[PDB]
Symmetry: C3
């Protein structure tokens, strides 16, 4: 239920919160117009994650969903967080590699579908169907990781070595991180109950902090963001 995992929600709230604080301070004296955007996109991610986590901790981001034949606690705020967060992360990778507009809109359009479809599946009352959505959602993710891995990498090979290499790191980091979500979702209480909500929450917590603080850290402390 929504009680014993409060500690993961509390610890995550704190980390995202501190995560925002640091980026804000770190980006204080940046004049480079390029880096400026990077700081904006990257700082906005943990900030949002902060408010969504706090809402899960205080209770607002938790709802109840019946399926299988029981009342299941679903943290919808997770999706609300991701819905705005993932596009930004994507935007970072794109600026860095200088992606085309068509491809950005495609990636972003695909991303909303991944989360929207994911949320839908989390709120679907027919236990069976929940897995269709998971499927459609995961497909969208693969499309995104495909374009990021091959599409972007190829695009980064024309950038100066600092960029090509920083991106590479971020590339591997996102590919590994992003794919853990559909797996965590699948084994957690939202899907095939194989791991308790308490663990599910902890797993997503580590994943969210890594994706919104780690990623930012790796990027914002690189020279790559300077034009």
């Amino acid at each position: 239920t929504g009680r014993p995992e409060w500690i993961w929600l509390a610890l995550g709230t704190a980390l995202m919160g501190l995560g925002t604080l640091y980026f804000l301070v770190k980006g204080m004296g940046v004049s480079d117009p390029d880096a400026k955007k990077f700081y904006a996109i990257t700082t906005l991610v943990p900030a949002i994650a902060f408010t969504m986590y706090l809402s899960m901790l205080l209770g607002y981001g938790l709802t109840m969903v019946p399926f299988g034949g029981e009342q299941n606690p679903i943290y919808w705020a997770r999706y609300a967080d991701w819905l705005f967060t993932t596009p930004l992360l994507l935007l970072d990778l794109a600026l860095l590699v200088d992606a085309d507009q068509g491809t950005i809109l495609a990636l972003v359009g695909a991303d909303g579908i991944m989360i929207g479809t994911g949320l839908v599946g989390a709120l679907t009352k027919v236990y069976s169907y929940r897995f269709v959505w998971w499927a459609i959602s995961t497909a969208a993710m693969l499309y995104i990781l495909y374009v990021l891995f091959f599409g972007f990498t190829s695009k980064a090979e024309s950038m100066r070595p600092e960029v090509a290499s920083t991106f590479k790191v971020l590339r591997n980091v996102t590919v590994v991180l992003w794919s853990a979500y559909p797996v965590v979702w699948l084994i957690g209480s939202e899907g095939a109950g194989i791991v308790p909500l308490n663990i599910e929450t902890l797993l997503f917590m580590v994943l969210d902090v890594s994706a919104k603080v780690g990623f930012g850290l790796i990027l914002l402390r690189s020279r790559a963001i300077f034009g």
Copy 2:
């Protein structure tokens, strides 16, 4: 009620789904930077339509609304679909004719109002009021079709003949299609019950497929999208 029309929802789900598949494959080997955006915008439309239709078919996109003095099944997913879909269609017409930013924001701003206001009217419990919203919504649509017909046409006359002519086709096609919605809505169960939900669903189904697959077809198979 929400049962006998399942077949229109199923057939539509299939068409949008196939609609996405084809565009994805067709845009596979496109290198032209212009066409690329076109494929992105146009492919994203049926994809979204796919997920929204599937949700109506599985039951998620259906809700119940009391008014007149009864429980009325309202497919809110239709609006959710249109909310993201219409801006994109508009974006296509704009890129094609090279519209100004002010006019795009205006058209898009007007579009959200058309759908938002339409949805509101679909969820309004006071039977009487439902028609005010329909009115406000239809006004917004007219504003859009006005700008598209005169504003854009004039803008397309400066483009190469392929563009001016392709646009023209799309222009007539959207003007005719878009205006059928406020009429279908008005005579269907969501408004003045003159046609059963079963027909209403079928009518919107034909309209959605034409607007998201036909339009894409006409455009994506034209030379117009190449810079």
Copy 3:
């Protein structure tokens, strides 16, 4: 409750409505590409405010929220209105002063957080918590007003005198207006009950009309919008 203040909702609906009408007509014969965007952004604000107010008047934008130990009428449509409105107002100030993209995304990202967080607090059932959100929301606002006052002003000093001065006016006007919201919210039925809903509604009404009609008036009637 949601009845005696209907007059403020009615009067506001009317003003926003007339507000849109005037801007539409005033921007009819504008050819300047710069001014065009300004008219678009500025006209779209009262239009949205119109639909949201009308929804509060008709009843749709009102909901009930228990907290403190009672049923409290909460006009969520206020937040829905602001959510789309404030970014636009911000966009106006930015175009006028020629702000960077990083700073716009930052301001807009901060703005959504201010409203999103504000709405959350308005729907939070735990009376106590409602004030945390108010706090987080108000912080975001200060961040925005900070950047607008110092950041933008500095940016406007490089524009021609008409712009620098018009902006200045708008600058003082928004700083004074925006900060009245968190105060009105705090003393109204949504926070520390010190003023009845009837007054709260009237206060926000004056504030919304000033922000969406006054601001537009001051700006749209200035030469500043011409490139």
